[PDB]
């Protein structure tokens with residue numbers, strides 16, 4: 001309703017006015033099928049510019065990082081009615097965010113069905129299950145003999161709504177979810193995607209084996225990019241279409257302008273002799289009229305010796321100088337980039353010509369002396 | 371030669387009732403609305419100045435009632451006094467209202483008050499007391515330190531902003547958002563006064579950490595206007611940030627290209643190329659977002675006209691500046707072409723990127739024959755896992771000038787047994803969305819025309835009516851352009867080109883269309899360094915004489 005005599009009943013059923021002069025309300029407030037104790041003292045008139053509001057310590061843990069919010073809302077909100085709307089809305093927010101603490105599953109469907117269904121698959125399949133039982137991650141095999149993993153993140157109702165599927169491989173995966181579908185169903189869909197992309201995988205595996213793939217290190221199955229090295233201090237980066245893998249990619253070369261120019265010319269001249277009945281390597285070798293190095297150096301292949309903020313060597317004369325005092329990062333930077341960076345952080349403090357604060361990559365103490 | 375008084379006498383009462391609103395622009399609203407209406411205020415002042423200049427003062431009482439109050443209100447408003455020449459014009463208005471020999475008491479009082487207000491604009495100490503006292507002490511006139519004073523005032527605020535910028539989420543003095551908006555409002559009226567331009571560029575780089583914009587778009591549009599009319603020349607980093615925070619500025623500037631290819635310099639592609647390279651579009655189109663927005667406005671124009679040769683030309687040029695800008699500023703960390711060109715095979719692009727500067731004249735037929743194959747794969751075998759359709763693979767084919775144009779000029783060189791692939795290619799270019807039925811018809815029409823033309827070339831220099839026969843529908847522009855290629859290419863031309871031109875020039879549209887053809891061809895040859903000097907001089911001559919006829 002308009003007025004907060006019926007509208008306040010309808011929108012706060014469990015707030016029982018104790019006093020005749022409706023100054024103390026007491027009892028429960030509702031949110032996400034959960035009721036909370038709440039005791040809300042007004043002054044002698046209906047003015048929230050001055051009011052008390054006490055809570056259960058339950059509710060106060062759940063209003064943590066909102067205290068100023070609520071105090072401002074008491075001062076800024078015209079009526080009690082709207083105040084309660086704002087307060088519920090804010091509870092709404094608070095719980096859904098802290099979703100890790102709050103999940104009472106209906107066992108009779110859940111924990112039994114999930115067991116039945118993992119039995120339906122086979123027990124070699126499942127590889128990880130979380131003790132909140134929210135996450136699972138499953139395994140599948142190629143005709144090749146490659147493992148590909150699938151994460152599922154599951155809700156209070158598994159069989160009702162979709163399970164959130166998180167997947168590696170580079171085309172967007174489609175799972176037709178019904179209430180009738182189950183783990184075996186989405187698993188068969190996932191196998192279908194595997195056996196479909198078989199060619200693209202063979203291309204990637206063939207490359208990684210018979211060449212010095214250099215930049216993506218331990219490649220995922222999602223990566224379309226392969227910065228291959230060849231000769232010395234020249235490289236080719238090659239971005240591939242999965243749907244037509246053997247077909248021609250967008251490509252270009254890094255290194256010496258005097259070394260690369262001839263290869264570009266030669267490529268532009270032989271590029272009509274690309275053929276999607278050969279392999280990518282068997283096309284590249286005879287198009288560019290070359291053989292590749294199979295790991296000319298496997299230990300000191302390359303460590304990216306660039307700024308790790310701006311990713312340039314030679315920013316206005318300056319060199320990658322300032323490093324991390326850490327064995328696991330070692331990452332060089334620039335004087336300019338690291339100063340601009342650390343000034344900005346809240347963790348940074350500046351002494352006379354010194355700036356203390358966190359390495360961008362590893363969050364360990366790093367010192368900059370201007 | 372009708373009204374003279376009336377429109378100005380109305381707009382007078384409008385502006386006087388507006389000046390009284392503003393009243394020294396010490397507040398937000400008075401400033402924003404002044405910022406807007408000032409320019410029209412200036413034009414009003416031009417018409418007013420003409421009127422007061424042609425006539426003489428103290429004699430006439432036309433608008434003399436409250437002209438005084440208008441010029442008071444004007445001058446004590448500093449946002450007025452800051453704009454291009456509004457000051458200069460106010461000076462002139464006052465110099466019109468002066469008198470040489472004042473006669474009644476009123477005229478002397480007037481003229482004194484006139485010197486007063488000029489002295490208030492130019493030479494008044496409406497500034498901090500101690501600095502006045504100190505300088506007067508050192509025996510300095512405002513004139514000799516104002517400049518350095520201004521310079522220091524600016525470098526201060528620019529510095530301040532750069533530390534605001536670098537302290538992003540730090541427990542340290544946060545430049546007041548209100549004050550930044552304040553400065554921005556003051557950048558507008560004196561953008562073309564060189565002693566702010568560091569401030570500006572500091573504003574555009576130094577965005578800071580807000581979800582909300584802080585600057586008011588009257589700032590962005592003042593700046594945009596001034597970039598395009600070349601009153602500003604900032605560095606390019608300034609203007610990428612400008613585009614990348616105010617979309618209607620980046621609209622406003624790609625539309626200010628369109629005025630250039632429509633009105634001013636129809637088919638002077640040198641002039642168009644130089645405007646694109648001086649504008650910073652290429653470098654700003656290295657950011658994939660601004661590429662996508664710009665090519666949307668290009669797509670909207672490809673449709674309004676159904677494949678206008680003039681917009682095809684501007685694309686070809688723009689793309690060539692862009693591609694050279696990509697290569698240049700893309701050593702490490704560049705976005706993959708399915709990012710700029712998402713609605714095609716990256717395969718096809720990677721072919722079409724290879725320029726003909728780097729291939730021999732003889733191997734271009736091979737290149738086109740490869741393109742025909744992959745386009746036919748994309749269009750005819752229009753299945754899942756492809757382009758969305760034929761139109762998209764065409765809008766790609768446009769963005770490469772060179773390849774679409776060279777087909778006709780290569781057909782004439784291989785007119786004896788023409789390759790079916792080239793006939794596919796050219797038919798596709800002049801007509802997508804036909805059915806195989808309509809493409810085969812077009813191809814065989816062109817094949818018969820190749821027969822007639824090769825007979826005519828291997829014959830002597832013949833009439834123009836023999837060509838008018840085959841000229842005499844859906845495939846007209848194809849045949850026209852191929853025919854012009856024939857004229858320029860064969861040495862049987864240079865004699866009977868005029869003879870066909872005169873007849874083919876039915877309308878002015880055909881004339882302009884062929885002119886665009888010829889400008890494109892000259893630009894194309896002079897780039898690629900491929901030439902018979904006969905054809906070059908002939909095209910130049912024809913183009914020169916036909917641009918007069920229109």
Ligand SMILES: [Zn+2]
Pocket residue numbers: 307309310311312315333334336337
């Ligand atoms: Zn750097």
Ligand SMILES: [Zn+2]
Pocket residue numbers: 324325326329330331359360361362363364
């Ligand atoms: Zn580190």
